[PDB]
Amino acid sequence: SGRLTGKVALVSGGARGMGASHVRAMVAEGAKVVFGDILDEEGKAMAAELADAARYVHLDVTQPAQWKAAVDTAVTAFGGLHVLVNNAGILNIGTIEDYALTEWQRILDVNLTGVFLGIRAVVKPMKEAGRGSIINISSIEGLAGTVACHGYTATKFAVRGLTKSTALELGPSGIRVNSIHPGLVKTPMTDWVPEDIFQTALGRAAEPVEVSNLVVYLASDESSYSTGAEFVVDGGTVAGLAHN
Amino acid sequence: SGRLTGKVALVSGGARGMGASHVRAMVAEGAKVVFGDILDEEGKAMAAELADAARYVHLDVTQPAQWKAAVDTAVTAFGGLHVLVNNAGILNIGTIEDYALTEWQRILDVNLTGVFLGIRAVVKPMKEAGRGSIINISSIEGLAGTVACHGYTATKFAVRGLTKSTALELGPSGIRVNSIHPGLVKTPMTDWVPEDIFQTALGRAAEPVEVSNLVVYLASDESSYSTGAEFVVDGGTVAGLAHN
Amino acid sequence: SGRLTGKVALVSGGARGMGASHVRAMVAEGAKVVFGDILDEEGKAMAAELADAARYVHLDVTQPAQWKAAVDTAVTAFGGLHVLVNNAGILNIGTIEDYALTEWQRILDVNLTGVFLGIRAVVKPMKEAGRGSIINISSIEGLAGTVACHGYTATKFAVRGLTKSTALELGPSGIRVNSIHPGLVKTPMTDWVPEDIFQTALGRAAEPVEVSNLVVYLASDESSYSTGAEFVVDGGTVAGLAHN
Amino acid sequence: SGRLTGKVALVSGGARGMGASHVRAMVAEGAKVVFGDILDEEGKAMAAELADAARYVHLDVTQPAQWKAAVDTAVTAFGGLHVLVNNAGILNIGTIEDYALTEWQRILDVNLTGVFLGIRAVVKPMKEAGRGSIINISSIEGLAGTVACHGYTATKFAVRGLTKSTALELGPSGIRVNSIHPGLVKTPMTDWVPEDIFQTALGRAAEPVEVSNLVVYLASDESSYSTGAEFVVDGGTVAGLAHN
Ligand SMILES: NC(=O)c1ccc[n+]([C@@H]2O[C@H](COP(=O)([O-])OP(=O)(O)OC[C@H]3O[C@@H](n4cnc5c(N)ncnc54)[C@H](O)[C@@H]3O)[C@@H](O)[C@H]2O)c1
Ligand SMILES: NC(=O)c1ccc[n+]([C@@H]2O[C@H](COP(=O)([O-])OP(=O)(O)OC[C@H]3O[C@@H](n4cnc5c(N)ncnc54)[C@H](O)[C@@H]3O)[C@@H](O)[C@H]2O)c1
Ligand SMILES: NC(=O)c1ccc[n+]([C@@H]2O[C@H](COP(=O)([O-])OP(=O)(O)OC[C@H]3O[C@@H](n4cnc5c(N)ncnc54)[C@H](O)[C@@H]3O)[C@@H](O)[C@H]2O)c1
Ligand SMILES: NC(=O)c1ccc[n+]([C@@H]2O[C@H](COP(=O)([O-])OP(=O)(O)OC[C@H]3O[C@@H](n4cnc5c(N)ncnc54)[C@H](O)[C@@H]3O)[C@@H](O)[C@H]2O)c1
Description:
The PDB classes it as oxidoreductase. The entry lists the keywords Directed evolution, GFP, SDR, hydroxysteroid dehydrogenase, structural genomics, PSI, Protein Structure Initiative, TB Structural Genomics Consortium, tbsgc, oxidoreductase. The structure is a homotetramer. Chain A is of the alpha/beta class. Chain A starts with 7 loop residues before the first strand and ends in an 11-residue tail after the last strand. Helix content of chain A is 41%, strand content 16%. Chain A has a seven-stranded parallel β-sheet, with helices on both faces. Chain A is globular and about 55 Å long. The first copy, chain A, has helices at 17-27, 40-50, 64-78, 101-129, 150-170, 208-219, and strands spanning 8-12, 32-37, 54-58, 83-86, 132-137, 175-182, 230-233. One nicotinamide-adenine-dinucleotide is lined by residues 12-13, 15-19, 37-39, 59-62, 87-90, 110, 114, 137, 139, 182, 184-185, 187-190 of chain A.
């Protein structure tokens, strides 16, 4: 408790799923949170329960003008911005032949370009404060491949890399950038996926808050000497070899 | 020798630099090679001195229709297509703030989408033959980040990932997919870069043929059990820690 | 505050350096701690200031008999054991030609075998509890190589691997196993090394507590979905490429 | 092909399995080979059918005296030594509790220490010719973990790390050091393991010659710019995520 007191955060895709969980988890730790999404109804609903500790803003991560407005909201409403959780994302699938180029561009736009636009938007106020933490949501798909999951895999691997280059550049400014790589988590993005799809050591899928606990750690000053690194939260899947 | 005798390859960005070196190396090994680029003048000159062993085609890797045409050329002129070297690529630099969104889009288009488009085009002929080897040129920049190199890092990491997902999917078809990660190689892309810019164990930059040797190996059947893997040829850079 | 309440831990090599920091940090979070070492004077000294929540024990990690005694102490004194921090370790250097084979054997004994012995000694009480967290101290030297640092490098890579095998096996029992990889940290092991020997994004060496924060997080149930994973805390070093 | 014509190689554990395969392949590629093992009968037998190009010696990789004897045999009989294939290794298994401490020590001595002893023994003759290729045999178990396979996993990870530390140190002398990581390979070490035990993209286990082709490539000058790197030949296992 109070581990994020004094900190202001911006969470992309915070209307439902893990994003919503991160928003609630950080507020519970004393942070003021601005969260954006395209699901206005849902966003305005939780904005009501959170009250003065949060602010919902419509934010299409592929739109730089919208990122700017979301950032202006945080600075003005809460006095500044110290944390960015690039959580917004989508999932599409298809074989090398059946996957539509439009689906490919679309996922590149949201999962990759959107993360980059988030970073470009938050660097000024973060650099002014002298201390910031950027948390990019990748996945274990950003560590290994999956059949018929080319666009998703390509972008999650891309985010993994963007984390490293930006961490290196922003380090001197007092800004840390790390990537989170989870296994299967219970959210609307995977409710159609069997919960034991991956071979985990823990024998179960993850609850969103289990990833939020990691978001809180990386957002806090507790992880002050960690940057440009991959934090895996997958129940052990990537720790072992794929066995039949 | 004839390490590639009987094989047909398609090399993007083969008008100069490493690509050109790959084309010459494979032809020397008995392979028939169709190489494409946007530098037609230089490309045609090469085709001239390579006579029947090769064909130059104009190929902008961001254009799917051009990939289709390149593949048709390889099939009609040589009867098949067994190897693809996704070598075409560009490098642009810039800090998070100064970097142009147009530079970012263009590098994603060339280095990432272009690689995916090549794969899409070569799978029909390869799948019908029941074998093939796709070689994606990533870089050690696809293994770690670099200051003001966000567009390049992100795409090289993405290529690294795409290699894995496509390899898992194409395995059952008898097609292998691997990624090559070279360090500094002497080519026009880096002639403005100091040869000893990386901390290497060998104490020198790479000659383009040294990477071509790796291309020939992955293209030949002597790498029949390797797929979805990263083959590093950087003189030892990523094997060590960045010291001051 | 109380993030580790009700948890009993065992820290090897906790008489000074990071080990001591870990003891202090965890006690501050409500944990009862038994810590062993071979520096009895220093061990008894700090055990005096933490007398109510901690217990010192002489423990040579190469001696399984001493590991068992360290465990019985934790179980009888505090009622059980839920956390193990395999922190004890040594550093020796030397070229391939001059490195003494006795030094090589010695470092494998302490740094590697010692880690495995600890795990063997804590699994029973942990399984009996149905919940536990094993934290193995590797290093960035366990992620890449270093000249004249063969024994340390090999052992640190070995810990990284042992972390994974034991994690997969212990997962079904409710026990998580992870490894920490820090960069240069200010401790007596490094008093002789310039604080800026590594190329870091943060431009400074680490403070032992900065690593203890990670130990705290991995010891708590907050990291419940993380097992078999590598947690890097190196100021960004391995995130970039080694430059001259 | 005469791909290794003129080079002299020393192979440990070459009396059967992959070791024998490597010997035969290298000799077939025009190389002179000195291969050691503890199975003298089998060693002397295949040395009789290779005669004009190979020399079998008794070599227990745990004894530096025998390593020195093997090395001197290569030099005196073939005039030098340019290639070392650290192939000797053993496999034992057991859960954290049942695993005998004697099995742990034994596999450390043979799998890790033996590899190190091999390197120590060959550097002098390689440093005189300012050229050398050291090929250490790791495994995909040196990349991820396996239940009840702690000694094996640890040592294979250790070999992976030792490869990098030594490569960095030997680079200035023109000596390359790389590690090979194969998946399931049909040899007497795993004739009790179902061939489809691993999730591969290729849908089969490897023939030992498929790994030998990789040893030849690394032994050849065609890999001149690769050192301290990991060469995976596992049919795709590690490129994918463990599924159920
Ligand atoms: N669900 C999983 O198992 C899992 C595993 C690893 C990683 N992830 C990643 O975690 C993130 C969140 O996943 P989730 O499980 O909550 O999925 P989700 O579908 O529940 O939520 C994603 C959210 O992003 C929002 N969003 C989508 N496109 C957007 C855009 N252009 N602009 C702004 N917001 C947009 C969606 O409306 C939604 O609220 C994604 O990056 C996802 O790839 C999920
Ligand atoms: N030079 C290095 O040190 C180094 C290190 C690692 C990786 N690489 C990679 O190797 C590849 C070749 O690099 P290089 O060093 O020879 O660079 P290069 O500039 O000499 O050659 C790249 C080639 O790609 C062609 N090309 C560019 N855009 C294209 C497009 N849209 N369609 C088709 N062709 C296009 C260029 O005209 C050129 O002939 C690139 O993917 C590069 O990123 C280079
Ligand atoms: N100092 C660094 O920069 C750094 C970086 C990465 C990892 N590490 C690791 O962190 C751990 C602790 O490092 P440190 O910096 O505090 O070193 P340190 O020398 O201060 O402490 C190591 C401790 O282990 C104890 N010890 C040594 N041999 C032992 C044995 N056989 N049995 C029991 N205890 C034994 C020592 O007496 C000492 O208290 C080690 O595993 C080290 O490899 C240190
Ligand atoms: N079989 C596989 O699937 C597989 C997969 C990855 C890695 N490997 C590795 O490849 C190497 C060879 O494996 P293999 O499949 O041929 O096993 P193998 O049992 O057939 O051969 C290993 C050889 O090493 C020799 N040897 C054992 N201890 C020795 C010692 N102390 N001194 C000298 N020689 C000794 C044995 O007599 C034997 O001929 C080992 O390092 C093994 O761990 C094997």
